[PDB]
């Protein structure tokens, strides 16, 4: 096989024309069991018991519903394109709005395959473990830390965090130790970030969200 050979400049529009691709691809020279038989195991039987799979149903419902037409779209959730807000980047500081951790400030880790943001606050700072969160319920601050050359374990997929009393397994505890062990030194790099991450966001008698800068 080969690459697309047609660089895309606009969604659904190729760079090269129909006749241009004829030359580039060089078409001017490149032209042209239901049933199984098994023995029975008894004499005067014949050993010719032909058995068929997918046998006829033993019961039919009184009425059936007709099948629906075709849609040429509406892909299942597993293959939807994951869209990430431009202000979200690895290492930025986020604010939780709806969960048990309302107002907590956390540092954004890798984004997962389901589109949920794998995020963590340093568990020694705000008692927030490695959790998934939705970008639509998170406010992005302009404060960023460099989480490059930081190793996130490969086994932190969505299935890892999917729900099954809750007990903290050792694997959750060990994985938490590994990640923050290399995150905290970067937290200490810039001053006063501990107090920023420890405190919670809240609205007061003054400021309004549409005037604030994030």
């Amino acid at each position: 096989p080969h690459c697309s050979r047609n660089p895309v400049l606009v969604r659904g529009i190729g760079r090269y024309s129909r006749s241009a691709m004829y030359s580039r691809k060089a078409m001017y020279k490149r032209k042209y069991l239901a049933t199984v038989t098994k023995p029975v195991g008894g004499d005067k039987n014949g050993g010719t018991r032909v058995v068929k799979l997918r046998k006829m149903p033993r019961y039919y419902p009184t009425e059936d519903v007709p099948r629906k037409l075709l849609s040429h779209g509406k892909k299942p959730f597993s293959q939807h394109v994951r869209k990430l807000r431009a202000s979200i980047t690895p290492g930025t500081i986020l604010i939780i709005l709806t969960g048990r951790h309302r107002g907590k400030r956390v540092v954004f880790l890798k984004q997962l395959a389901s589109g949920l943001l794998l995020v963590t606050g340093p568990l020694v700072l705000n008692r927030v473990p490695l959790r998934r969160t939705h970008q639509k319920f998170v406010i992005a601050t302009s404060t960023k830390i460099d989480i490059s050359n930081v190793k996130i374990p490969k086994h932190l997929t969505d299935a890892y965090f999917k729900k099954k009393k809750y007990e903290i397994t050792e694997q959750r505890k060990i994985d938490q130790k590994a990640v923050d062990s290399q995150i905290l030194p970067k937290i200490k790099a810039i001053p006063q970030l501990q107090g920023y991450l420890r405190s919670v966001f809240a609205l007061t008698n003054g400021i309004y969200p549409h005037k604030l800068v994030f």
């Binding site: 046998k55 006829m56 149903p57 033993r58 019961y59 039919y60 419902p61 009184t62």
Partner: protein, 125 residues
Amino acid sequence: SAHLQWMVVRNCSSFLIKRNKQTYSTEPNNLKARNSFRYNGLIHRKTVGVEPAADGKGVVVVIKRRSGQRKPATSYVRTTINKNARATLSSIRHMIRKNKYRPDLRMAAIRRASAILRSQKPVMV
């Protein structure tokens, strides 16, 4: 003639029930028990009907004899089926498709049979 007779019993028949904006017809060998030219067990030269057996085991399949159209005493011959449910539908399907005996109630006949077999097994609480 089937069409001529249908235009008479179309709206005036002792088997006709008109109620709750629905219509039903209760002649003996009528699958789906509906008022229609297709599903009428009286006006066709050949009809197909399935009923529960005298006891609560199996179904009775009755089809209309070709000759005695004006002799109702011998017009219908009845056979009883007391095999497995899957065997019953396979047996009934052969009476219609293989004999080419009204190959439009074939799907309907299986549905009524399956409903009858459900009523013969015990119902759990």
